[PDB]
Design a protein around this motif. Sequence first.
Motif, PDB file in Angstrom:
ATOM      1  N   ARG A 186       0.878  -1.082   0.102  1.00  0.00           N
ATOM      2  CA  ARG A 186      -0.087   0.003   0.020  1.00  0.00           C
ATOM      3  C   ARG A 186       0.766   1.254   0.047  1.00  0.00           C
ATOM      4  NH1 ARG A 186      -5.628  -0.639   1.096  1.00  0.00           N
ATOM      5  NH2 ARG A 186      -5.083  -2.797   2.314  1.00  0.00           N
ATOM      6  N   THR A 187       0.743   1.789  -1.202  1.00  0.00           N
ATOM      7  CA  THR A 187       1.747   3.204  -1.380  1.00  0.00           C
ATOM      8  C   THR A 187       0.723   4.328  -2.063  1.00  0.00           C
ATOM      9  OG1 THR A 187       3.728   1.797  -1.143  1.00  0.00           O
ATOM     10  CG2 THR A 187       3.678   3.931  -2.453  1.00  0.00           C
ATOM     11  N   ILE A 188       1.291   5.511  -1.862  1.00  0.00           N
ATOM     12  CA  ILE A 188       0.876   6.378  -2.698  1.00  0.00           C
ATOM     13  C   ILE A 188       0.941   5.901  -4.475  1.00  0.00           C
ATOM     14  CG2 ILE A 188       0.940   8.737  -3.580  1.00  0.00           C
ATOM     15  CD1 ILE A 188      -1.098   8.459  -1.540  1.00  0.00           C
ATOM     16  N   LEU A 197      -0.864   4.605  -9.551  1.00  0.00           N
ATOM     17  CA  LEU A 197      -0.591   3.745 -10.772  1.00  0.00           C
ATOM     18  C   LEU A 197      -2.403   3.269 -11.012  1.00  0.00           C
ATOM     19  CD1 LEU A 197       2.371   1.478 -10.591  1.00  0.00           C
ATOM     20  CD2 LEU A 197       1.640   2.565 -12.345  1.00  0.00           C
ATOM     21  N   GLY A 198      -3.104   3.156 -10.065  1.00  0.00           N
ATOM     22  CA  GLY A 198      -4.373   2.757 -10.153  1.00  0.00           C
ATOM     23  C   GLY A 198      -4.913   3.829 -10.989  1.00  0.00           C
ATOM     24  N   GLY A 199      -4.758   5.043 -10.560  1.00  0.00           N
ATOM     25  CA  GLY A 199      -5.493   6.437 -11.400  1.00  0.00           C
ATOM     26  C   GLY A 199      -5.803   7.403 -10.420  1.00  0.00           C
ATOM     27  N   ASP A 200      -6.283   8.673 -11.056  1.00  0.00           N
ATOM     28  CA  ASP A 200      -7.095   9.592 -10.286  1.00  0.00           C
ATOM     29  C   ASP A 200      -8.177   9.190  -9.743  1.00  0.00           C
ATOM     30  N   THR A 201      -9.168   8.588 -10.221  1.00  0.00           N
ATOM     31  CA  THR A 201     -10.463   8.296  -9.523  1.00  0.00           C
ATOM     32  C   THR A 201     -10.175   7.663  -8.138  1.00  0.00           C
ATOM     33  OG1 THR A 201     -11.585   8.325 -11.882  1.00  0.00           O
ATOM     34  CG2 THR A 201     -12.784   7.131  -9.892  1.00  0.00           C
ATOM     35  N   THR A 205      -8.643  -0.925  -7.842  1.00  0.00           N
ATOM     36  CA  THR A 205      -7.480  -1.356  -8.172  1.00  0.00           C
ATOM     37  C   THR A 205      -6.767  -1.984  -7.116  1.00  0.00           C
ATOM     38  OG1 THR A 205      -7.090  -0.124  -9.991  1.00  0.00           O
ATOM     39  CG2 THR A 205      -5.105  -0.721  -9.089  1.00  0.00           C
ATOM     40  N   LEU A 206      -6.731  -1.372  -5.891  1.00  0.00           N
ATOM     41  CA  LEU A 206      -5.922  -2.016  -4.765  1.00  0.00           C
ATOM     42  C   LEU A 206      -6.632  -3.100  -4.251  1.00  0.00           C
ATOM     43  CD1 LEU A 206      -5.034   1.183  -2.486  1.00  0.00           C
ATOM     44  CD2 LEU A 206      -3.652   0.104  -4.092  1.00  0.00           C
TER      45      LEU A 206
END
Lengths: 249, 249, 249, 250
Positions: free
Chosen positions: C183-185, C190-194, C201-202
């Motif tokens: 768990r990282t910013i 990478l998953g995206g802005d939304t 994604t996480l």
Amino acid sequence: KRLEGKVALVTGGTSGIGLATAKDLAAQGARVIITGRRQAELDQAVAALGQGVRGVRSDVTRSADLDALFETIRATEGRLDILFTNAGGASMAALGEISEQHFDDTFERNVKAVVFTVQKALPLMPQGASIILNGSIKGSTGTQAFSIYGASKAAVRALARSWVLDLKERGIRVNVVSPGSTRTIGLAELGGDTQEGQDGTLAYLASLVPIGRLADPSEIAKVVSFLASDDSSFINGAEITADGGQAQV
Amino acid sequence: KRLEGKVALVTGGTSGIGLATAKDLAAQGARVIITGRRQAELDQAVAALGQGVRGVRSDVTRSADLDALFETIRATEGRLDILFTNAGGASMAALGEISEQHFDDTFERNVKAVVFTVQKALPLMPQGASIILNGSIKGSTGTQAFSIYGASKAAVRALARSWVLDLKERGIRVNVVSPGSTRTIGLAELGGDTQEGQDGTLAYLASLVPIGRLADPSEIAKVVSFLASDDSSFINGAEITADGGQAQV
Amino acid sequence: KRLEGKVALVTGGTSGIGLATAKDLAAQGARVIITGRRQAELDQAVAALGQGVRGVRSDVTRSADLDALFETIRATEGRLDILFTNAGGASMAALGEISEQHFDDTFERNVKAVVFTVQKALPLMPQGASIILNGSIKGSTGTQAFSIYGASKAAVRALARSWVLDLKERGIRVNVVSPGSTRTIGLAELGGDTQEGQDGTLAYLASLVPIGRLADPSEIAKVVSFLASDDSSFINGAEITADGGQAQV
Amino acid sequence: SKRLEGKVALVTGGTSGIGLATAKDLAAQGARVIITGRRQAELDQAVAALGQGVRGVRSDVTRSADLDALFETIRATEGRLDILFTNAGGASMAALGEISEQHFDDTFERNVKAVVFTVQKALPLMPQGASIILNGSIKGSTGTQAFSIYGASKAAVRALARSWVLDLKERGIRVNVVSPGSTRTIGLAELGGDTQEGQDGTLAYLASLVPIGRLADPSEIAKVVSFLASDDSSFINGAEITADGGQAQV
């Protein structure tokens, strides 16, 4: 005292890496149970370790000893948090020279006993417990006249990968410690009956290590202790190799 | 043709990968001996495979059976250029349900039998002979309820690494073919007794393969033929994995 | 405590695993220097880390920034016992969409910068120092649209194997930590802005982990700290994978 | 043999060593082969020696314009690419503490970057069932003093294949890696040094490291590439096949 309140069992606790691991785990404040085949060696190990460490006489290759051993843990502590299997042995036979007896002893002590030691321990092991299996760089390398031993070590490493999935519901994680050449009675005994003759073998093995020295057993024990601790919470199914760089290069 | 003048032995030649390998090697002009536990399957398989293929009925776990097989080869042909071990089985047991009979059956058939099939073969094997051992991607991966099988396959691959050194003076080279999921009677029977049960299992396994299909046994046989041929002359102790990319990704 | 009297440098210290490592090493008593590319983020990280933590603004790809970084460490602390390289990035490009900028940016930060961070660090490092390189399970696995990143991570792991031999006379040991999904910013980015797209994604990535959770960065930081400590004295050129079992199975 | 009959193969770095041996073996199997070389005279000798419908294109894989010209000749001539083998790669030695930015940049540009863009530019030409073979090394998975940069580059090559399996899976193209051990090549000889005695001593020492006790002939590695190029490798994807005489296995 990070492992205080944690109970640990080391099979093959009387000598070598298991001895040093039992000692290292005891320093952490973990109550430790060690097994040996021979009472006097177990008594010397228990007396040497002290530190609230108990010892049970036991041969891993017989189910009754394993049943009696875990029955002793259930009656006394009743939970196992850490398990380390060190009861394995190595003997040398080149291909064309391998006896059926030689194969059977190697796999029964090195593989089967690991399977049933782990299986019998599981009810005592809570969620979040840590299992460390005895691996070797011999499992992933080639050594002459040591094919049976290396195959047994590779099998031990494979068990952890599948056992990750089998133990996932139980929250128990399985990891493998793989030592390089380490100064031990077992290594020296392999070198020869002569004192200087075995010593020459040890000098040769140190030459093969890239850092140029054999390991002190404590250096391997530190790896087991780390896997035993909660610091390894995200480590599962992994192999940690302490070889001085030998198998890495 | 490519392998004519060469003698090959395939244990477990009656079904699956071993049968496809017997067919491929015979097509190359090799004399092939195949072993099966059941005479009717062994006869039928020999009938279909061709004039080159002959069949001996043996249980690789029996020392007497292995001795009998090699002795007929010594009188019938007198040498063994190619050895491929396909006599192996898989059964499922999760940790906590593993029975001692389950451990012994799998390890004796997949590991012990390989050791002695190879050992008994050696006097027949000339310089430049090729040995191919049956591995699995299960040896290198984790599968729930298949830990004993995977450990046995990992042991098989490790044997080859040390046997390179044992056999180096003899000039015999040892390699491992590691199949992914392959359509075989054995794979179907792990799926279940129901045919919708095997079909559901087989479709799910194909979904695991990146290219999306199970392998035909001939595709694995092609790897064995390559290793058996002189083209693999600089390959020794290596593992060739044909899995459709499953363990590679 | 354990690290008391040790100086550690963590490049990419401001976020994620590097931040957790800086905190853990300082908690163990090491003097810690962290590197950040951006000033505002670097100051906030140092302030949260507080005592025992110094910050230098540097971009690993620039060489003058590296010179300034090691000159200040030399002028102030005068030695470097621990080096951890965490300044690296991942970007998405499928084969057939990869750009030259995408290849150059990844390899300059993930591989080239590691080579020169290590090279310029060496004069400060005493005998017995520990270097930890940032790997990934992406180095030994396949991930769609991530090929360049995986190749960069494999190059990082490979550097350590040879660097063992390059460094043996200096007494410096090199090891690799390979995280699974943590768990990282960055991972959320990478998953995206939304925000929902990140959470989805996480959640998908956690489904891939056998233990069923993403790692907290501290769980990776403990591995670096273990390798940084003298407990890792016999570990050289090795890779320790903290992935929850994902790549181990 | 004609196992590869009707197939078009491109070998980058085809003029010498394993690439030359591979072009020869593919051509004997009946493939149409295109080889690339940096130098025209060497390229001409390779094309003349190979014979058998082999065409040579003078190109530098590190130059993007050369790659565009090369694939333009294939599009204009053969119209398809069934087999790709990338052998345009180099090794130079620098120990840690002496590694120069030019030494790093030259190695990774030729050994990794050129591979990515050679493959990327080839893909539109490659039909379903095409085969890609990447040049790896046992040096990628082992430690060698003063060769860290080279080993890192080969490890990068091997990793590219694992992900490319997934990227290429609807195209039906399969990617695999051949990893040779010590193979008797002019490059390997030249790495020993300018002196023949220096080359001979280094070559004799490397042979002692091989368990079977000899360096490989380049044809022994080429045989592995032909197998991967052929339809026999239909179930092999993302895999590494190591022909090392047993060196890295033990």
